[PDB]
Structure formats: C-alpha cells, structure tokens
Design a protein around this ligand. Structure first.
Ligand SMILES: CCCCCCCCCCCCCC(=O)SCCNC(=O)CCNC(=O)[C@H](O)C(C)(C)COP(=O)(O)OP(=O)(O)OC[C@H]1O[C@@H](n2cnc3c(N)ncnc32)[C@H](O)[C@@H]1OP(=O)(O)O
Length: 411
C-alpha cells in the first residue's frame, strides 16, 4: 500500500507491467501552464535550495550529506563515499540544468538535510525489438513504432534524506518538487534506478563482484570464504591464487583514451549501444564528458590496431566507507562503465579492465548484469551479489525486458 507511489504515473503492479506491449506515456498530455509555478510548500523551518554545482563549497556540502547519509548495505557495514570530483562529474554533464538539482536545508543554520538530482539524458525508449516483432504480426507496427525517436528526458539519482529526518515523508515532497521543476522545463519522463523494489521496474539486474584483493574483502566482511575452499589447509591462500591476475594487460595496443579518440569511441560505442532496446544517445561532448579519463573518477582505455581505435573500456571509482573495521576504513571499488569490443572477445577486453583496476589499487570490480555484462561473469570469476538494481521510468509504460536489453549505465 504505497501512499505516495499509488498517486503517481507509474505502472502500479507487476501484472499491469506484464500486460504492457507498447511504449508510451502514462499521463494524458499536459502543458507547462498546467504545472504550478511556485515550489511546493514545506515546513516553515526548512527551505528549498538550488546548489551551485560549480562552487566548491556547495559540492562540499552535498558531498558531506551523501557521505554520512547515502546508501548503506543492509548490515550498515559499508556506505557509499562518492567523492567531490565524482559528484561534480555526475551532476554537471553537458547542458545540465541547474534547477533540476533540488535540495532542502534548515533555515536557522543552513544545514543541508535532503537532496535529489536530475540530469538530462537523451534516451531511446521505444517499444522493444521483440515486442515490435509481435506487434507486426498483429498489424500494430505503427503503434509499436510511435515513440522510437530518442527522447530528451531526466535521469534522477542521489535521492537522499538525512538520517535524522527519515520516515517523515520528506522523500515524496522532494520527488514531487523535482517532478515540478522538470515538468516546468517541458520534460515529462524520467529514468531512475534503485536497489529496492518500487512500482514498477521495467527491468532488474543482479549485481556481480570480481574480487581483486580477496584478503581485504574477507577481512572487512564484504566477502566470505566460499564453503568449497574449506577443504584446503589455507583457504585464503587458495582464494588469493584463484583471483590472481597478470601484472600487465594482455592486449598489445591498449592505452589511455585521449581527447583525439572521442570521435572513434563515439562511433564504436553508439554502434554497440544502438543494439539494445533502452540506451542513451551521446554527442561528442557527452562522450568526452563521460569517458575522458579524470583522476580518481573515471578510467578509460582504448585498443588501437593499425592507427584505428577498435575497442575500448571504461570504469569509474566509488569508494565506500567501511564502518567499524579495526584495520580498514575504505573499500576502493571500480565499477564497469561503458565499453565496446570489435576486434577481440569481450571477456578478453574486460580481463584487461580487471588487470588495470587491480594495478591501480582497486579492491573489487562491481557491475550490474546490463549490457553484455552477464556473458563474462563465469569466465572472469565474478560472483553474484546480494543486491539487484531495478530500472524504472516515470510517466512511461514500458514492457518488461531483461537487463541484457538495457544499455544505460547509472552512476
Ligand atoms: C518527469 C520528471 C520526473 C522526476 C522524478 C522521477 C521519480 C524519481 C523517484 C526517486 C528515484 C530515486 C533514485 C535513487 O536515488 S535510489 C537511492 C535512494 N537513496 C538511498 O537509499 C539513500 C539512503 N536512504 C535515504 O536517504 C532515505 O531512506 C530515502 C530518501 C531513500 C527515503 O526517505 P525516507 O526513508 O525518509 O522515507 P520518506 O518517509 O521520506 O518517504 C517514504 C516514501 O518513499 C518511498 N521510497 C523509499 N525509498 C525510495 C527510493 N529509493 N526511491 C523512490 N521512492 C522511495 C517509499 O516507498 C515511500 O512511498 P510510499 O511507499 O508511501 O508510496
């Protein structure tokens, strides 16, 4: 019984979602004129605040809110610690809209208490290929193709309410106010992810994790000793051997991506992403923004053969605070980002990612089974995680799809 989500333009049940066969909007059309001009009222001790993401002190305030109050694991042993440089990167892509970053602060002391972020993305979100096949059989190809044009929508992330203000219905008001500012911009759909189940995902993918420093991961209780290893005299020793990696990449031609690589990377990435049912469309400027190496934030390598870029991979860094371990205070996680392989098997491309990440000091490589990520899980010794990432749209009916038909990486 969802007091807020039952009022919203999202499919309300799995049964409803299972019956959706065409993509399109949920709400009847509205105009900007239909949308309230003023921010929603809130308690007189609080005020709305739009952070200036180009101000180091505002980024620092957001940083500290998220550091202390953002996503924790179920046992409260790890908490995301997105860096300030990461936040400026994720929040300020090309043509970002400052007003879509919505915060609540306390009037008296100006303390930041809650936050939600939206950024523009151009997303292909038309009817899935297989549903189009079936629709053509029924003579409904026109209906199924109606919304194939890429759409300029909002991607929502970083929803966060201070631990002190939880379960006080602040999150719905934040979501409503974000929806209002986005609607006032003449944007009517959003895409978001969450590790929890809400009404109603169009896709869900399990997390997988590739141990790079298994001794640390066991010590901090990220991982355990698999039971099969208890047959050994020194299980940890054999675990370290199992996960051992070469010290250098195996692909001749691998090097860091350069600005001059952007056009070729854009071409091979878009060729790949275009084969998925849901996926972003990136300009040169967005490829540069999201993939050019940034110290401590995003790491991107290309394979060059005969003076042509034929493959690339990227990963980004999010450390987690380790809560209450005597020997470690941080978990250094690399997350598989976008990639594209044309000259080599994908598992060989991602093996070099693991090797590079290990050599740059990362403890674990994480991913969700979107893109073709599932296809190399066994080959490269990823293990299944406890968590799933659910993909949602706001104001968009969408048929259920497998995560392997999703090509949008969420930071
Ligand atoms: C066109 C433009 C549209 C733009 C908007 C598109 C939609 C965007 C939607 C948001 C996309 C976010 C994507 C991310 O960032 S996902 C990550 C979310 N953040 C965290 O998990 C950080 C740690 N947790 C918190 O900060 C709080 O617990 C949050 C803020 C999550 C809830 O605060 P609190 O614990 O103080 O609760 P409340 O009393 O204020 O509110 C209770 C209501 O909140 C619903 N709830 C709980 N968790 C989530 C969740 N993750 N997405 C959506 N709704 C959620 C819940 O079902 C209930 O509604 P209902 O069950 O009564 O109906």
């Amino acid at each position: 019984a969802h007091a807020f989500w039952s009022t919203q333009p999202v499919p309300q049940t799995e049964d409803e979602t299972e019956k959706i066969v065409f993509a399109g909007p949920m709400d009847e059309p509205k105009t900007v004129a239909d949308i309230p001009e003023e921010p929603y009222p809130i308690a007189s001790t609080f005020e709305w605040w739009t952070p200036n993401m180009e101000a180091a002190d505002d980024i620092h305030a957001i940083y500290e809110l998220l550091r202390d109050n953002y996503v924790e694991d179920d046992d409260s042993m790890f908490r995301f610690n997105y860096s300030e440089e990461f936040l400026q990167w994720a929040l300020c892509p090309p043509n970002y809209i400052p007003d879509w970053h919505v915060a609540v602060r306390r009037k008296a002391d100006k303390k930041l208490l809650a936050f939600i972020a939206g950024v523009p993305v151009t997303l292909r979100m038309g009817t899935p290929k297989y549903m189009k096949v079936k629709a053509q059989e029924r003579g409904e190809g026109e209906e199924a193709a109606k919304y194939d044009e890429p759409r300029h929508i909002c991607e929502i992330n970083f929803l966060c309410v201070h631990k002190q203000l939880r379960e006080k219905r602040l999150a719905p008001i934040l979501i409503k106010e974000a929806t209002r500012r986005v609607n006032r911009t003449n944007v009517w759909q959003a895409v978001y992810t969450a590790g929890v189940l809400l009404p109603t995902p169009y896709a869900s993918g399990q997390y997988f994790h590739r141990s790079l420093n298994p001794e640390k991961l066991v010590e901090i209780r990220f991982s355990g000793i698999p039971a099969q290893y208890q047959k050994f005299q020194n299980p940890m020793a054999m675990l370290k051997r199992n996960y051992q990696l070469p010290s250098a990449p195996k692909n001749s031609g691998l090097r860091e991506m350069k600005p001059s690589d952007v056009p070729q990377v854009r071409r091979i990435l878009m060729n790949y992403l275009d084969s998925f049912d849901v996926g972003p469309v990136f300009s040169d400027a967005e490829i540069s923004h999201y993939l050019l190496p940034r110290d401590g934030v995003v790491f991107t390598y290309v394979v060059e053969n005969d003076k042509k870029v034929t493959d690339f991979f990227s990963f980004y860094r999010i450390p987690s605070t380790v809560i209450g371990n005597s020997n470690y205070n941080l978990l250094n996680a690399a997350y598989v980002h976008y990639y594209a392989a044309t000259s080599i098997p994908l598992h060989q491309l991602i093996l070099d990612l693991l090797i590079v990440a290990h050599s740059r000091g990362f403890d674990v490589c994480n991913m969700v089974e979107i893109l073709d990520n599932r296809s190399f899980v066994e080959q490269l010794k990823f293990g299944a995680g406890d968590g799933h990432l659910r993909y949602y749209f706001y104001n968009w009916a969408y048929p259920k799809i497998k995560p392997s038909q999703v090509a949008l990486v969420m930071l």
